[PDB]
Amino acid sequence: GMSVPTTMFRLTGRDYPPAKLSHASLIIIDAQKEYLSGPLKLSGMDEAVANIARLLDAARKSGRPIIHVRHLGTVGGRFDPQGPAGQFIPGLEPLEGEIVIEKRMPNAFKNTKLHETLQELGHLDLIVCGFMSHSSVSTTVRRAKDYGYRCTLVEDASATRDLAFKDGVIPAAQIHQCEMAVMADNFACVAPTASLI
Amino acid sequence: VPTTMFRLTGRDYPPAKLSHASLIIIDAQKEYLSGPLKLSGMDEAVANIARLLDAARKSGRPIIHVRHLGTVGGRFDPQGPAGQFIPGLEPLEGEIVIEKRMPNAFKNTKLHETLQELGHLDLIVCGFMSHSSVSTTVRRAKDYGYRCTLVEDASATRDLAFKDGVIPAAQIHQCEMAVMADNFACVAPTASLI
Numbered sequence: 001g002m003s004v005p006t007t008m009f010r011l012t013g014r015d016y017p018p019a020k021l022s023h024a025s026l027i028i029i030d031a032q033k034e035y036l037s038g039p040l041k042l043s044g045m046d047e048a049v050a051n052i053a054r055l056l057d058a059a060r061k062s063g064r065p066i067i068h069v070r071h072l073g074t075v076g077g078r079f080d081p082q083g084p085a086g087q088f089i090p091g092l093e094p095l096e097g098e099i100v101i102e103k104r105m106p107n108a109f110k111n112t113k114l115h116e117t118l119q120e121l122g123h124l125d126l127i128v129c130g131f132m133s134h135s136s137v138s139t140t141v142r143r144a145k146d147y148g149y150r151c152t153l154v155e156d157a158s159a160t161r162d163l164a165f166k167d168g169v170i171p172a173a174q175i176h177q178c179e180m181a182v183m184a185d186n187f188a189c190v191a192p193t194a195s196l197i
Numbered sequence: 198v199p200t201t202m203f204r205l206t207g208r209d210y211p212p213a214k215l216s217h218a219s220l221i222i223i224d225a226q227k228e229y230l231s232g233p234l235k236l237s238g239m240d241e242a243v244a245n246i247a248r249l250l251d252a253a254r255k256s257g258r259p260i261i262h263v264r265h266l267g268t269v270g271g272r273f274d275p276q277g278p279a280g281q282f283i284p285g286l287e288p289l290e291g292e293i294v295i296e297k298r299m300p301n302a303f304k305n306t307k308l309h310e311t312l313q314e315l316g317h318l319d320l321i322v323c324g325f326m327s328h329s330s331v332s333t334t335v336r337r338a339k340d341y342g343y344r345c346t347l348v349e350d351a352s353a354t355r356d357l358a359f360k361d362g363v364i365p366a367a368q369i370h371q372c373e374m375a376v377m378a379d380n381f382a383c384v385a386p387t388a389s390l391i
Contacts, residue, residue: 005358006233008329012271039200078205106380110340134376135202139336146304155360163375164199170375178372181359182328186300190360 008186018189019125019152021058021196025065025118028052029108029130029137031092032070034078034085035159042131042159043172051157051193052129053091058197060095065121067099068092069108069130069140106139115147125150127196128188129157134179141188151188154196155180202380212383213319213346215252215390219259219312222246223302223324223331225286226265228272228279229353236325236353237366245351245387246323247285252391254289259315261293262286263302263324263334300333309341319344321390322382323351328373335382345382348390349374 009015031052035042042048059066073079073086080086094100101112108114118126126149130137137158141151160179162172184190203209225246229236236242253260264282267273273280288294297306312320320343322335331352335345354369378384 004363005356007358011233039205040202074206105340106336107340135380138332138376142301142333142336146299146301162199163372163379164201165371165375165378167198169198170372174368175372175375177359177361178364178369179376181357181364181369182332182373184359185357186329 007184016150016189018191018195019127019150021062021064021127023123024125024127024152025067025121025123026055026059026127027067027069027108027129027140028056028092029069029128029140030071030132031068031089031130032079032085033087033089034071035131036089040078040161042161044159048157048159049089049092051154054193054197055127055129055154055157056092065099065123066094067101067114067117068094069101069103069114069136072102072104106136107143108136108140109143109147118147118149124148125152127152127154129154131159133158133160133176134163135160138179138183138187141183145187152196153180153183153188153190154193155190156192201378210344210383212385212389213321213344215256215258215321217317218319218321218346219261219315219317220249220253220321221261221263221323221334222250222286223263223322223334224265225262225283225324226273226279227281227283228265229325230283232279234272234355236355238353242351242353243283243286245348248387248391249321249323249348249351250286259293259317260288261295261308261311262288263295263297263308265330266296266298300330301337302330302334303337312341312343318342319346321346321348323348325353327352327354327370328357329354332373332377332381335377339381346390347374347377347382347384348387349384350386
């Protein structure tokens with residue numbers, strides 16, 4: 001057969017199974033209207049949002065803990081909390097009983113008590129989705145590793161945008177695939193929505 | 198060509214000047230020269246770390262060597278070659294050495310204490326692997342309010358598996374440099390700093 005890279009997980013024998021929704025807490029990062037238009041408009045949003053909605057539906061049907069994260073934002077600015085950009089994406093609004101936090105940093109733990117909350121909920125397995133894959137999602141998943149959580153990142157329920165590399169452009173798909181490979185190497189199980197619901 | 202999150206939020210800062218900076222070299226160890234963790238483009242990355250070290254030493258700057266602890270039968274075997282510094286990238290007396298177990302070089306280390314003691318908000322970061330310990334450490338440094346400049350040609354990674362196959366080291370590295378430049382560090386070549 002064909003030789004391929006080995007994940008840090010498999011090399012060290014630290015690979016864990018993907019999360020089962022039935023034993024997990026679901027975390028939806030930054031499902032906000034900022035990402036539907038303007039310079040932060042993300043690629044492949046129709047399907048990523050449809051998949052977040054599927055995960056939410058499944059989590060609610062199953063009675064699982066659900067945590068919604070949003071940017072604190074800036075009044076009159078990006079993720080404006082007094083304007084459309086700070087609002088939840090239609091269909092991805094929280095319901096009564098669900099946890100909702102506001103954060104300043106890409107790391108959703110920093111000054112939010114997300115750690116205390118996840119301790120209280122009692123699950124080491126986290127299912128993670130949202131935006132942007134390379135920034136708040138990547139950072140939060142990495143931080144969760146430090147606290148000993150097992151993350152399963154839902155690759156088709158997350159998105160990013162085209163990024164600059166010097167005076168050129170890397171498509172959103174290429175950024176996203178690279179970050180999914182990076183996550184799978186050493187920071188999370190990476191899985192499609194259909195495998196969880 | 199896209200703008201950055203930094204510029205959109207007005208949170209962009211200038212690249213570091215070596216004269217006002219602390220230099221951090223992440224895991225410049227022999228593990229990454231051979232074996233399953235052999236990284237791509239190491240000849241030039243190591244030559245550039247050596248250039249940064251030279252320049253930092255000539256100018257009397259704080260230099261922090263982060264080394265991975267390692268384990269018997271694991272990576273960076275601390276009783277064997279893999280755990281040693283790459284030739285030419287060894288510390289000199291009066292430099293700092295910090296041992297770590299996790300990709301985040303702050304976790305269970307005195308790296309934060311040390312950076313605070315050194316006084317410099319500006320960090321020049323290089324080393325290995327770009328997507329794992331380097332990316333993680335630079336992301337964590339944002340939390341503490343540090344300004345990072347990541348030296349893209351003094352860092353490296355390896356080919357990785359994904360759902361649709363194998364992504365070459367060069368592609369991983371370029372994408373992570375674009376990611377870093379969006380929201381986590383100024384990204385600059387070695388030549389611009391020395």
